[model samples]
Target: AQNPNCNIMIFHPTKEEFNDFDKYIAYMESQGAHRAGLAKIIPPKEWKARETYDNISEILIATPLQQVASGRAGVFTQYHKKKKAMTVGEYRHLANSKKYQTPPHQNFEDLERKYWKNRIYNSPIYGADISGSLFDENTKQWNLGHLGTIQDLLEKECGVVIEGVNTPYLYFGMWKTTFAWHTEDMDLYSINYLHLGEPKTWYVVPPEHGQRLERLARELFPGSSRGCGAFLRHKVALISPTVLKENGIPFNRITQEAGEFMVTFPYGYHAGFNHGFNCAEAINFATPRWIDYGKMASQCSCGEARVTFSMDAFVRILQPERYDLWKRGQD
Candidate 1:
């Protein structure tokens, strides 16, 4: 986390608020960035429903193991850093035996109000980044539902065309499907829309202390101040937020209920568990402020920090784009 100080922002806006959603969201970057908070956009028409999401993810279930293996689909645990090179189908079969049991739900019309409460965290059906399929290059609209996003501005005005920035990475998780702790690339911003699920619990660390926490988790990080040799004594370092708090790194926690957008700002460290089987879509974007981080361009991989946004190129072209906009505004 790199900022002044932070707290998360949860806002509920109607569908019409974002017909020109790209620009609307850009207006939001400052709010989210300055606060070191996550701006979660809650939809008005309806929170995303799983009935629709299952159709797309079934693509993974139906695809052959070889193809899935060509990518990264496999069995992984909530506490460990690993994806066992298994397929969607393979993970499903293993879930039946992970020794984990799914308890009964409390359906009172209370319905899925909080079914199993833990599903948002235990059942192991885990799927990560499926952006390749979620973005329509021809149409430039998102396939996983949330259509308005920062990508439009990045593409329309900033001359950014990178696929990862344009599309979102999908995370499918069941009870206790935990995501590891990390910061966004080059301090860019990320918007995560919980398409449908119980609720995901987020543990957020503001930019100031987030670094202190990082300095502590040196073993799992490469090229760390400690050493690159520190790649792994373990894949996923289960450093509890408690440990950071004990060290005096103040933090905040929020439970993102069904249908909220969580905005994690540049350098804000966020990690949490999925409480139920859920489908979520997320993507990253750069602000005019990211130009200063042009020197941070770097590679991303398993157990690595990534420069998901092309900050350098964006900055190179941004001067002209800003000038053109400024001059037009004056005119």
Candidate 2:
């Protein structure tokens, strides 16, 4: 009751064992509504960190050393612009060599007052969501959850494989690689499953004060205080926690380890960095309650801002019966 930043928590598999689909859903909802937390569970046998990471180049459209070529590392600049690009061969050989970035500001106020066209950060650029889906791109099939069912419905309408905008997005990161602050599109929850890697440090601000943080962000960068998607699309300046704390905002941190699952609730403002090399998978999900937010996101830019959780497709797959009384509605 005393802490405003208590929305984040951690649970170990030792006590709250989640074995089946039913158990997973129960555990997810049990963490409370509109919250983000971590669960300590071993990565399933089918998807280990190294196993998935080895397939990165084949899965994503690798952007090479920007020498008019394609490769693995797609590094970004400090102000959200593209930066040093590399190939899988070079990355694998020289991967851990790149260190995290440090802000080029004399003080946090310098950021509050100044802006850099190509902001140079203190660490190597981390893929915002470059880690990737659990889908094996070679076969173009998902081996994770029921994403294929939703994808089929979406493809029937859109007629295109809307990668990150539609399904789980991958994030490939190394030490100090960072992503700016933002929330899930529309009002939806997300799960960030770290397939493998070092810990990821997160700073989350509750939805109640999201707008305030946005107001502050808008002044510093041209990104959205609304979603920050526009800003995250480019290299953006780092929002120092000291600056946020000095403003009297409520926020805190949680270091997520490999084989752990981090759930981010709707409209929760979150940003963080990779402590070291890591590979992670993130995807948006919708409960029945997410309908309103889904529709709202659908209304944006050709009616598919949240292409992953398209309203029309979701409604189509949703069961007619609100709940199955056979399992006492827990199903």
Candidate 3:
């Protein structure tokens, strides 16, 4: 059962607010919505939605079955995992089947261990590539390029093309198929949209309590914490709200339904699972407010924690004519 107090902020934006993305998100930030680490946006019910997932039924992809034996959250710590190559349609059929269900009368632990094993976790399909393959021009409007706040700073300014960062990634999830707790790459802002399907539940910790959650992770798993300064980037930690509350760490729970959007602030730690078969698309973007956070991340210790993009290059791009002044100001 979920904690009654662990709810995230939800915004019901008017048509005008939803149309003007930048000002609306900035207003959200001003309202301290970022304190929850992430927030949900429900567009006007009357607004018609785009068909982003159309025409991908026969696309082939290998999905790995995530195995969780514990009553706790599922953890993926190894690369040598099992997978099966199947078309999107076949996987969707399997996802909607009774094999993934646990009867109400049965003991969940016992039946989970005996009957239902493994969930389909599909790899993301690059948004650009997917749209190109589908020959759908309207699909581009749904991708990160058009959806992000000041996203042009990543490409038009920095010219750094990091897939899943500046570019969008489409995902497919089934019942209880989980994404372990983790921060975004280089701690950039992340936006996820549930194009369609059953609701997805997310647990997020504000940036202020981020290190507290990291410390808890290290205390629980010492072996992985040795040299990994950015261990959460490994995407293997998944602590429930019950555990977080017990440890005095703050958290918020968000249930994203179809046609809604979820935004994760920079340095915000987040994790979640799908209710059933679902399709989602996500990508990282940056606003001017994110510059300082990006600078701090560029100063990493471990090679494993090295920054993904070149900060100097990014700065130069943002301030091409005043690069010397910008460099001097940093010092």
In order of listing, the candidates' clash counts read 18, 23, 0
Instruction: Rank the candidate models, highest lDDT first.
Output: 3, 1, 2
Writing each residue's lDDT as its tens digit, candidate 2 over 1-331 gives: 3223446655444323433433554465565534432223443434333344555554432542211111112222243335556543344444366333233456433432222222232435445545346544442222333342334434554464433235666776765556656666544666777776566777777765666766666665543435433343222435666667777767766677787777676567787666556777877764544545444331222121223335333433332232132123122
Task: Give the Å error, residue 266, model 1.
Answer: 1.1
Question: Candidate 1's residue-wise lDDT over 1-331, tens digit each?
Answer: 3235566665556655644555655666545544554556666653233334444534453221111111111212133224445544444444445343233555332322342232323235466665443333342222334453344546664566644335567666665556656666545677777766567777777765655656666633334434332222222333454455566766777777766667776666676766656667777765555444423422232233322344333433444434343233223
What are the per-residue Cα lDDT tens digits for candidate 3 across 1-331? 2223334678898876766666877888877777778989887765644645676777665644544433333333422244666776876777776776322334433333322233323322111112212213454333454665344566554565533324556666776666767877556788887777776778898887788988988876677688566676656556666567788888877678888889998888898767667777777777767766665542223433333334346545444554464455344
Highest TM-score among the candidates is held by which one? 3
TM-scores of all models?
0.62, 0.61, 0.73
Candidate 2: list runs displaced more than 4 Å. 1-5, 13-27, 30-33, 36-61, 64-77, 80-89, 98-123, 127-165, 222-237, 295-331
Model 3 RMSD in Å is: 7.4
